[PDB]
Amino acid sequence: HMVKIGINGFGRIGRLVFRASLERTDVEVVAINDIMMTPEYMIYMIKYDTVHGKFHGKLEHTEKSIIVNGREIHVLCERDPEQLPWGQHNVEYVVESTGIFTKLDSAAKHLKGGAKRVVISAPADTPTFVMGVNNHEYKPEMTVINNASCTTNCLAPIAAVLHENFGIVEGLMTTVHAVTATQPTVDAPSRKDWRGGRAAGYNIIPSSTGAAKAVGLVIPSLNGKLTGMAFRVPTVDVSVVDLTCRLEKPATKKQIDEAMKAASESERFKGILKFTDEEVVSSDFVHDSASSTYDSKASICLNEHFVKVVAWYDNEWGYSNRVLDLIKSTAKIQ
Amino acid sequence: SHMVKIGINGFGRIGRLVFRASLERTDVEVVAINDIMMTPEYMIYMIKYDTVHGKFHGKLEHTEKSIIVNGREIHVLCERDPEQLPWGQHNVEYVVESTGIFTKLDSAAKHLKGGAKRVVISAPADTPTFVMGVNNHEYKPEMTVINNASCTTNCLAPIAAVLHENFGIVEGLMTTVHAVTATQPTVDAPSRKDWRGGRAAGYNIIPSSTGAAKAVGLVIPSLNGKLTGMAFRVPTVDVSVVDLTCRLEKPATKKQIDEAMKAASESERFKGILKFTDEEVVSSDFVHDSASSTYDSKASICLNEHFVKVVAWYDNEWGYSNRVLDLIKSTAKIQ
Amino acid sequence: HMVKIGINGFGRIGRLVFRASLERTDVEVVAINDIMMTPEYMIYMIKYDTVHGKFHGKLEHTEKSIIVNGREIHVLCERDPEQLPWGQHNVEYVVESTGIFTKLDSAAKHLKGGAKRVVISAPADTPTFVMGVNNHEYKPEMTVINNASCTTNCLAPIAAVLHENFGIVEGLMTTVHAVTATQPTVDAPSRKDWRGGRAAGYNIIPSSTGAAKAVGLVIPSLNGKLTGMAFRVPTVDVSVVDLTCRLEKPATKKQIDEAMKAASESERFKGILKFTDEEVVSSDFVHDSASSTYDSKASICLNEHFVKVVAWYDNEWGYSNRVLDLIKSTAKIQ
Amino acid sequence: HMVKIGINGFGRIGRLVFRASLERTDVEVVAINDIMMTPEYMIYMIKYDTVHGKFHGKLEHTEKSIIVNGREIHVLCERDPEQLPWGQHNVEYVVESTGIFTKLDSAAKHLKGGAKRVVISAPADTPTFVMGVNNHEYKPEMTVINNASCTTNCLAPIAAVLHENFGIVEGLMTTVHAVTATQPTVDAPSRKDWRGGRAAGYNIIPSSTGAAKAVGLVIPSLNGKLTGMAFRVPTVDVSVVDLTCRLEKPATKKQIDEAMKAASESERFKGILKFTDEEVVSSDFVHDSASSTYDSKASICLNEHFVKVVAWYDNEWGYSNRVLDLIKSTAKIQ
Ligand SMILES: NC(=O)c1ccc[n+]([C@@H]2O[C@H](COP(=O)([O-])OP(=O)(O)OC[C@H]3O[C@@H](n4cnc5c(N)ncnc54)[C@H](O)[C@@H]3O)[C@@H](O)[C@H]2O)c1
Ligand SMILES: NC(=O)c1ccc[n+]([C@@H]2O[C@H](COP(=O)([O-])OP(=O)(O)OC[C@H]3O[C@@H](n4cnc5c(N)ncnc54)[C@H](O)[C@@H]3O)[C@@H](O)[C@H]2O)c1
Ligand SMILES: NC(=O)c1ccc[n+]([C@@H]2O[C@H](COP(=O)([O-])OP(=O)(O)OC[C@H]3O[C@@H](n4cnc5c(N)ncnc54)[C@H](O)[C@@H]3O)[C@@H](O)[C@H]2O)c1
Ligand SMILES: NC(=O)c1ccc[n+]([C@@H]2O[C@H](COP(=O)([O-])OP(=O)(O)OC[C@H]3O[C@@H](n4cnc5c(N)ncnc54)[C@H](O)[C@@H]3O)[C@@H](O)[C@H]2O)c1
Ligand code: NA
Ligand code: NA
Ligand code: NA
Ligand code: NA
């Protein structure tokens, strides 16, 4: 009946995918692997959250399990995903959220232990999906997929509405992004992203992202039409997309607002793309499960063909919820 | 002449840093300071310690009505109303109007009543607007009250000038990711004119309005109506960054754009005002960098030869404060 | 049937008192004054909160009121408390939380408007109360009282337990305190308190507090036995008391832990003084209504007569609930 | 002539010891090992410093060295210290600042590669030194020593002064401490210190420190008379000690200020312990090379036996300068 899930990497995304799994009855986490955590430590990690507040529910552990609201969840213990006995616990989907196995060569190792399918919680050299955008393109032969990046999940629904209604001639994207675990507290090594090693809480930090190019993977007609970059800034969670586009068809501000609003009420995007015309700031989206919230009042245009659209996203919570949505969506496809 | 004598109204982030910078050059001196929330004793403390630009090194003393900085007396005034300030009495030629509350010509002009000769408003204002390196030569000697634009306009306009003169900017949209400033509160608090702006500064990304990009069309008139923009205030204590997305008329390869910026940074016109980097910089790398604008070639990107996103950094406190003094020096030569 | 409350100063305390008032059926806010807010602005302020999250109910407004979960609350915008029409809306208690009427002379002006009693949300030259500590000392002739400071409400219950069980010979307190509205975001003027003008988010800032001296006002036998200081540090909310004591009688760690735990379960301190033995940090107390949470793991001693007790407090939410508690407590006294 | 130094672990302490070494002609760094940095990345990390500002000089690199102000410094990449060829570069002292070789046996591994002496940049169970307090107890058989913690270097001079003038009967210390590299930017694993895993920039975090006990080793008569703890708070650098102690001989505030002032002017403590009576905050000590600055205005007493002394320290810069001072001091002893 329920889709049984294992989590590899019980981190920000792993633990919030876990929390979200507790709030819906169609999906459940039955096993967790994190080589940095014992069951008693996992319980501590679940219980308290700087961003998303305290867990409310019963938490206990055994030597090899945690017990959440009276339900046993098996705690595995292997550094090497090839050694994880997912099959022993009837795990159908593994959420690959360590941040270190985002290549197909790595993520596929979960299959060896009998997981049926893997969702990588990051861009990867695998089929890429964004709920509301291309999740219906999933094919049952695909055993390893990814849910793209948080930024892609914010941008793609916005781009979809813009392109469908007005046509994106070309776009340049900036995302102003909260800190994440990849950044250090002080100036420290980060050999693949130099700027990314600078003290996270005390700098605006340019970062590369592939989100805007990536949108061509989920909206093929936008391939080659977007590119972008990022600034990491000192906030603990919630990020924002700043998408500057030339549009083919003229759009009044009212027409863009109305298209976003319509989209947010549509079957396709309900709960994924949201709308606001209020005077919001980033903390207002903490624990908002949208992939994207269009900010009517912050979005501007120079003229009817050149616009800057602003869209908010809880990079932790929205994405985690989308991971579960993608598991549910694709699980019906056998 | 020999030294332009300056009075500072509002001894705040900009006022005190204009003061500090004035000590580093011999062609200008501050001879009077007015700040309604400070005593001479308090002013010395303000000068001495600075969370961002570090400790003052130099001698600081005060009297009942003066501060003494490296042995030199600076008169401390005390008037809430600019109309009351005896600037002429203290031989003040230029007033730096940096309170943040007299950015209207109607208020800032009142410094003239007390005998100041010229006034430079440290903010956008309904007056002639200047950005050093871009239009300071358009200054006319009859311009008695002028402004030095915003920190953001001072960062954006040099970039826009280089792009426009080389390739022609058809249209542009600007975002600035901006450090917090005194206008934001530490906790969610009233801001009746800018609601978002009342939210806790240190804990939010806050969209904010800015006329900086439109203002570029005032300092570069052929760009009037071709630019607009906005801001996100983020939790950094100082240093901000401009993100200009524009369509170019002539094609520009990345190399061309890189070369244009570099050549501009070396030119007499922009030297020290527009700088160039190709290094992996982040915002704190520009703390106490007196540039108006540092072009970031590695962070700047483009989609094609007519559609580009240029990234440029500015110490919103220190670059601006130095440009205020540059503007004073420049315009003082025009009588 | 229900104590009717007016709020003067709809700030961090004012708005959170208001939120707290929605969760209990024995008090209700029927009028709000704030000179910086239209009704429209007031519901914005309620709706979104950087620290305590978005309002979960429904908000509307009129030209003269706000409507909160369908209940109309009259709204005012009058600078002078003497001019507030509290009586016309049958306000019994006024919460004086502007921060600028913290003197008997000023705060008493509310009674001229027909309010019956006033609770000043800060130390003042009025009878001073701390729930759980001296609130039963209230006398019906006391028409203007105060609820002390957030720090006093944290320190006093901890001090009470220590002093009553073991006797405090002497105590020296430090509070590591979150930033508040009294601090600026950049180095700015603060003529009365020079350090207090320094950029709040980028400094550890020594500050003077009266809290430890204040505890003599609610625990007379401790008068002259405590003093202390504060460091303001860059957190948006939640503070912690660090109280170093010489005890008259010896106390083992166990005895201190169990005395605090017992106190936390007593009817006297239940919900006021709480206990933890978990690995908590400050964000774990965001929206914790305790005045004080004794931290058993963080508290240390050198020996049985020399201890350092650590106690957490949400300086916004704890105190705000205590204001409603004090109103409730004293209203019974006629 | 100069003492030739190798640095193992080119992190916050490593790099700042390096910068400080350029400002004095009696010591020079000739070799650097960091397993997370190429020479190219190394000069980036020197060039830009979030806290201490841009390197003013010019940097280049080769495949095996960095060039600083025209001078070649050899770059090693060995995870295992026993494989580091210090002797080949005539390295006398190794600064062991990786944070992971803080044991006698691990730090001694540098001797195998031909280093003559090792200074561990951290608490260790080795001979422990605080400049100004016990550096003259160094003996030449001590080939592996440590320079204590930043906190011990702040506290020890303060304790020495109190104890020598008034006698410390007992003391409890808190340090309110800047974030360091051991803390993550988001809630992350910290198996041996649960609280230390919580998001650094968004919490007041109780932490343990052995500084107070350690002062008992550096000042033997204080053994067993001090203990303490820490709160990590969101600042990028600079920390403060809050020492609450009981004095044997009664002391007035005046007598304490005068003792601290006299000490600060002594040959023994000049540049090490400083004195202020100004309204300072933590950023005022950024790049202040003192081990300790006694804050006369913030320090308080309850009575003449019971005092709370506040002392500031740039935990990065003061400490890094002390490392070089200790090397200079002990190098003379052969
Ligand atoms: N944080 C975000 O905002 C966000 C949003 C969307 C996607 N992502 C992506 O999700 C992934 C995880 O990100 P995060 O922020 O949750 O990271 P994180 O650092 O919070 O969590 C990673 C977890 O993996 C664990 N781990 C490490 N090696 C492991 C191994 N061999 N086996 C098992 N567990 C292991 C770590 O102990 C840690 O708990 C990354 O790919 C990241 O890019 C992050
Ligand atoms: N901080 C920046 O990054 C920056 C950059 C460029 C321009 N500006 C502009 O410069 C102006 C000042 O900005 P700031 O950051 O220095 O502000 P600030 O709040 O730091 O300084 C304002 C100062 O004015 C004083 N003051 C207030 N009323 C006064 C009066 N009646 N008479 C005299 N002094 C009075 C205050 O006491 C304070 O010292 C504003 O217009 C601001 O927009 C700021
Ligand atoms: N913030 C805390 O953690 C805390 C805790 C306990 C007690 N307190 C005390 O409570 C009081 C309020 O503190 P706060 O943090 O909520 O401050 P705040 O600045 O957030 O709120 C003050 C409010 O009063 C309003 N106001 C100002 N003048 C007014 C007037 N004449 N009439 C009506 N409204 C007016 C302001 O517009 C603002 O909304 C202070 O005395 C403070 O010391 C604060
Ligand atoms: N940061 C402070 O304020 C401070 C002050 C005094 C002492 N200390 C102590 O000094 C030490 C270093 O602290 P830090 O803040 O500089 O840490 P850091 O994380 O900034 O620096 C440690 C460096 O060691 C490198 N490293 C790790 N393993 C290595 C190995 N096997 N070989 C070579 N290099 C390796 C890392 O790549 C990193 O650059 C710790 O013991 C710390 O407790 C820190
Ligand atoms: Na479930
Ligand atoms: Na000068
Ligand atoms: Na109620
Ligand atoms: Na040297």
DSSP-derived secondary structure for A84-106: --GGGGT--EEEE-SSS--SHHH
Residue C240 bridge partners (DSSP): C176, C312
Residues 6 or more apart in contact with residue C261 via CB below 8 angstroms: C275, C294, C296
Contact B230, B175 (CB under 8 A): yes
Contacts of range D164-167, beta carbons closer than 8 Å, 24 or more positions apart = D165/D249, D165/D251, D165/D255, D165/D256, D165/D259, D166/D247, D166/D248, D166/D249, D166/D250, D166/D251, D166/D255, D166/D256, D166/D259, D167/D247, D167/D248, D167/D249
> Helix, strand or coil for residue D238?
coil
CA dihedral sign, ordered C284, C288, C291, C295: negative
Residues 6 or more apart in contact with residue B2 via CB below 8 angstroms: none
Question: d(Cα D166, Cα D225) in Å, to the nearest integer?
Answer: 14
Question: d(Cα B208, Cα D243) in Å, to the nearest integer?
Answer: 44
Residues 6 or more apart in contact with residue A207 via CB below 8 angstroms: A177, A193, A195, A196, A229, A230, A231, A232
CB count within 10 Å of CB B303 equals 19
Mutate to test the pocket of ligand 3, among C18, C82, C83, C97 (most ligand atoms within 8 A of CB): C97
∠B73-B76-B81 over CA atoms, to 5°?
155
D14 lines ligand 4 (CB under 6 A): yes
| Closest C-chain CA to B317 | C186
Question: d(Cα A128, Cα A218) in Å, to the nearest integer?
Answer: 7
Cα-to-centroid distance, A96 and ligand 1 (Å): 8
Eight-state DSSP code of residue A128: B
C12-21 and C317-331 helices cross at what angle (nearest 10)?
60
Q: Find, among B152, D188, B236, B175, the residue nearest to A198 by Cα.
A: B236
What Å distances lie between residue D76 and A49, D109, D320, CA to CA?
40, 15, 21
- Do B284 and D50 lie within an 8 Å CB cutoff? yes
Q: Find, among C212, C243, C242, C210, the residue nearest to C227 by Cα.
A: C212
Residue C186 has its nearest CB partner, among B38, B42, B181, at: B181
Contact B75, B33 (CB under 8 A): yes
Residues in chain C: 334
Please tell me what resolution, in angstroms, this structure has: 1.9
Give the tokens for residue C308. 């350092």
What Å distances lie between residue D165 and A151, A196, D40, D297, CA to CA?
62, 50, 52, 20
D317-331 and D150-165 helices cross at what angle (nearest 10)?
70
| Closest C-chain CA to D286 | C203
> Helix, strand or coil for residue C330?
helix
Residues in contact with ligand 3 (CB, 6 Å cut-off): B 187, 189-190; C 8-14, 33-36, 79, 97-100, 102, 121-122, 149-150, 180-181, 315-316, 319
What Å distances lie between residue B116 and B16, B90, C47, C285, CA to CA?
19, 9, 48, 55
Question: d(Cα A305, Cα B144) in Å, to the nearest integer?
Answer: 40
Question: d(Cα B280, Cα A194) in Å, to the nearest integer?
Answer: 7
Q: Find, among A64, A77, A84, A27, the residue nearest to A324 by Cα.
A: A27
Q: Find, among A213, A44, A196, A255, the residue nearest to A128 by Cα.
A: A213
Give the tokens for residue B231. 């801001």
Question: d(Cα A191, Cα A182) in Å, to the nearest integer?
Answer: 12
Task: Name the closest ligand to CA A79.
Answer: 1
Contact A158, A273 (CB under 8 A): yes
Residues 6 or more apart in contact with residue A318 via CB below 8 angstroms: A150, A153, A154, A288, A289, A290, A291, A292
Question: d(Cα B60, Cα B43) in Å, to the nearest integer?
Answer: 10
Residues 6 or more apart in contact with residue D316 via CB below 8 angstroms: D12, D13, D16, D51, D52, D150, D237
Residues 6 or more apart in contact with residue C215 via CB below 8 angstroms: C152, C155, C156, C159, C222, C226
State which approach was used to obtain the coordinates: X-ray
CA dihedral sign, ordered B302, B307, B309, B310: positive
Mutate to test the pocket of ligand 2, among B76, B84, B99 (most ligand atoms within 8 A of CB): B99
Q: Find, among A102, A20, A45, the residue nearest to A320 by Cα.
A: A20
Pairing outcome for strands D239-247 and D168-177: antiparallel
Cα D40 from chain centroid? 27
Contact C124, C104 (CB under 8 A): yes
Q: Find, among B216, C286, C152, the residue nearest to A236 by Cα.
A: C286
Contact B281, B314 (CB under 8 A): no
What Å distances lie between residue B313 and B131, B166, B239, B251, C303, CA to CA?
16, 21, 7, 24, 56
Question: Taking the C-alpha atoms of A189, A190, A195 and A200 in order, what is their torsion angle to the nearest 10 degrees?
Answer: -70
Which amino acid belongs to residue B241?
V
> Helix, strand or coil for residue A40?
helix
Question: d(Cα A313, Cα A287) in Å, to the nearest integer?
Answer: 10
Which amino acid belongs to residue A97?
S
B13-22 and B318-332 helices cross at what angle (nearest 10)?
60
Eight-state DSSP code of residue B46: H
Question: d(Cα D64, Cα D67) in Å, to the nearest integer?
Answer: 10
Residues in contact with ligand 1 (CB, 6 Å cut-off): A 8-14, 33-36, 79, 97-100, 102, 121-122, 149-150, 180-181, 315-316, 319; D 186, 188-189
Question: d(Cα A237, Cα A203) in Å, to the nearest integer?
Answer: 15
Give the tokens for residue A134. 């291309």
In sequence order, what DSSP letters do the residues of D154-173 get, joined into one string? Answer: HHHHHHHHHHHHT-EEEEEE
Q: Which helix (H) or strand (E) holds D275?
A: strand D273-276
D99 lines ligand 4 (CB under 6 A): yes
Residues 6 or more apart in contact with residue B298 via CB below 8 angstroms: A206, B277, B278, B279, B280
Burial B171-181 (b: 16+ CB within 10 A, else e): bbbbbbbbbbb
Burial A37-47 (b: 16+ CB within 10 A, else e): bbbebbbbbbb
Question: d(Cα B196, Cα D323) in Å, to the nearest integer?
Answer: 48
Cα-to-centroid distance, D222 and ligand 4 (Å): 29
Residues 6 or more apart in contact with residue A166 via CB below 8 angstroms: A247, A248, A249, A250, A251, A255, A256, A259
Domain boundaries along the sequence of chain B: 1-149+317-335, 150-316
Cα-to-centroid distance, B142 and ligand 6 (Å): 25
Q: Find, among A172, A151, A156, the residue nearest to A244 by Cα.
A: A172
Question: d(Cα D144, Cα D129) in Å, to the nearest integer?
Answer: 11
> Helix, strand or coil for residue B37?
coil
Residues 6 or more apart in contact with residue A313 via CB below 8 angstroms: A150, A151, A153, A154, A238, A239, A240, A241, A285, A290, A291, A292, A293, A319
Give the tokens for residue B96. 């730096």
Helix (H) and strand (E) counts in chain A? 7, 16
Question: d(Cα A48, Cα A55) in Å, to the nearest integer?
Answer: 6
Question: d(Cα B288, Cα B315) in Å, to the nearest integer?
Answer: 7
Cα B108 from chain centroid? 17
Mutate to test the pocket of ligand 4, among D12, D78, D209, D232 (most ligand atoms within 8 A of CB): D12
Contact A276, B192 (CB under 8 A): no
Q: Find, among C10, C303, C298, C291, the residue nearest to C152 by Cα.
A: C291
Q: Find, among D165, D272, D162, the residue nearest to D225 by Cα.
A: D162
Catalytic positions of D are 150
Residue A80 marked as a ligand binder = no
| Closest C-chain CA to B201 | C185
> Helix, strand or coil for residue D6?
strand
CA dihedral sign, ordered B197, B203, B204, B210: positive
Question: d(Cα C97, Cα C326) in Å, to the nearest integer?
Answer: 14
- Strand intervals (E) in chain C: 3-8, 27-33, 59-61, 65-68, 71-76, 93-96, 117-120, 144-146, 168-177, 205-207, 226-232, 239-247, 273-276, 292-303, 306-313
Q: Find, among D95, D82, D98, D113, the residue nearest to D27 by Cα.
A: D95
∠A13-A16-A22 over CA atoms, to 5°?
140
Contact C45, B191 (CB under 8 A): no
- Do B51 and D280 lie within an 8 Å CB cutoff? no
Residues annotated within the binding site of B are 13-14, 35, 80, 122, 150-152, 181, 210-211, 233, 316
Residues 6 or more apart in contact with residue D50 via CB below 8 angstroms: A186, A187, A198, A199, A202, A203, B282, B284, D236
Which amino acid belongs to residue A152?
T
Q: Report which protein residue has its CA nearest ligand 4's atom 14.
A: D12
Question: Mind telling me how many Å the CA of D51 is from chain C's nearest CA?
Answer: 12
* Cα atoms found within 13 Å of the Cα of residue A120, Cβ hemisphere only: 29
What Å distances lie between residue D97 and D14, D17, D186, CA to CA?
6, 10, 24
Question: d(Cα D180, Cα A236) in Å, to the nearest integer?
Answer: 17
Q: Find, among C154, A302, A259, the residue nearest to B216 by Cα.
A: A302
* Cα atoms found within 13 Å of the Cα of residue A175, Cβ hemisphere only: 32
Eight-state DSSP code of residue B101: S
Phi, psi (deg, nearest 5) at residue D319: -60, -45
**Topology adopted by domain A149-315:** Dihydrodipicolinate Reductase; domain 2 (3.30.360)
Residues annotated within the binding site of C for D-glyceraldehyde 3-phosphate are 149-151, 180, 209-210, 232
- Do A12 and D198 lie within an 8 Å CB cutoff? no
Contact D33, D84 (CB under 8 A): yes
Question: d(Cα A13, Cα A21) in Å, to the nearest integer?
Answer: 12
- Do D172 and C280 lie within an 8 Å CB cutoff? no
Which amino acid belongs to residue B154?
N
Give the max Cα distance, chain D: 63
Residue D74 bridge partners (DSSP): D31, D65
**Which residues have a beta carbon within 5 Å of ligand 5, which is an ion?**
A 21, 28
| Closest A-chain CA to B192 | A279
Question: d(Cα A3, Cα A27) in Å, to the nearest integer?
Answer: 5
For tokens 């049958």, the residue is: C90
CATH 3.30.360.10 fits B150-316, yes or no: yes
Phi, psi (deg, nearest 5) at residue C227: -150, 175
Question: Mind telling me how many Å the CA of D14 is from chain C's nearest CA?
Answer: 24
Residue B311 bridge partners (DSSP): B243
- Strand intervals (E) in B113-205: 118-121, 145-147, 169-178
Give the tokens for residue D311. 């002392």
D106 lines ligand 4 (CB under 6 A): no
Burial C122-132 (b: 16+ CB within 10 A, else e): bbbebbbbbbb
Contact D147, D204 (CB under 8 A): no
Question: d(Cα C222, Cα A120) in Å, to the nearest integer?
Answer: 60
Q: Find, among D282, A92, D67, D147, the residue nearest to C187 by Cα.
A: D282
Question: d(Cα A308, Cα A168) in Å, to the nearest integer?
Answer: 12
Cα B151 from chain centroid? 4
